[PDB]
Design a protein around this ligand. Structure first.
Ligand code: SF4
Ligand code: F3S
Length: 106
């Protein structure tokens, strides 16, 4: 499965959902996650994310391993999102800021 990591938080561009063939993205207030059981690892979403926050599981950075389990957990409680929407206000300001997990909203 593919995994959404740290840089998505407070950016949430949502450009990734338009190319997902199986609609396996789930939406949080300021973050998106990928459902590991529905994802077919087509990898089409990776180049579409301006935040470059999506990685295949085996490529998730060492300092963001927590996101693998987190995607699986939140994908079970958040609503499905299949349509592109406007990025969060000030997404540009937060794109590139590290350790945004501290700002994750349930
Ligand atoms: S790898 Fe493919 S199936 Fe998985 S979330 Fe990305 S676009 Fe969807
Ligand atoms: S910022 Fe997040 S909402 Fe999608 S386009 Fe990137 S994983």
């Amino acid at each position: 499965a593919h995994v959404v990591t740290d840089n998505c938080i407070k950016c949430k561009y949502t450009d990734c959902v338009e190319v997902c063939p199986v609609d396996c993205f789930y939406e949080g207030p300021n973050f998106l996650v990928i459902h590991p059981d529905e994802c077919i690892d087509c990898a089409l979403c990776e180049p579409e994310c301006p935040a470059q926050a999506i990685f295949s599981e085996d490529e998730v950075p060492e300092d963001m391993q927590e996101f693998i389990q987190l995607n699986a957990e939140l994908a079970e409680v958040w609503p499905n999102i299949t349509e592109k929407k406007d990025p969060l206000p000030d997404a540009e300001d937060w794109d590139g800021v590290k350790g945004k997990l501290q700002h994750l909203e349930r």
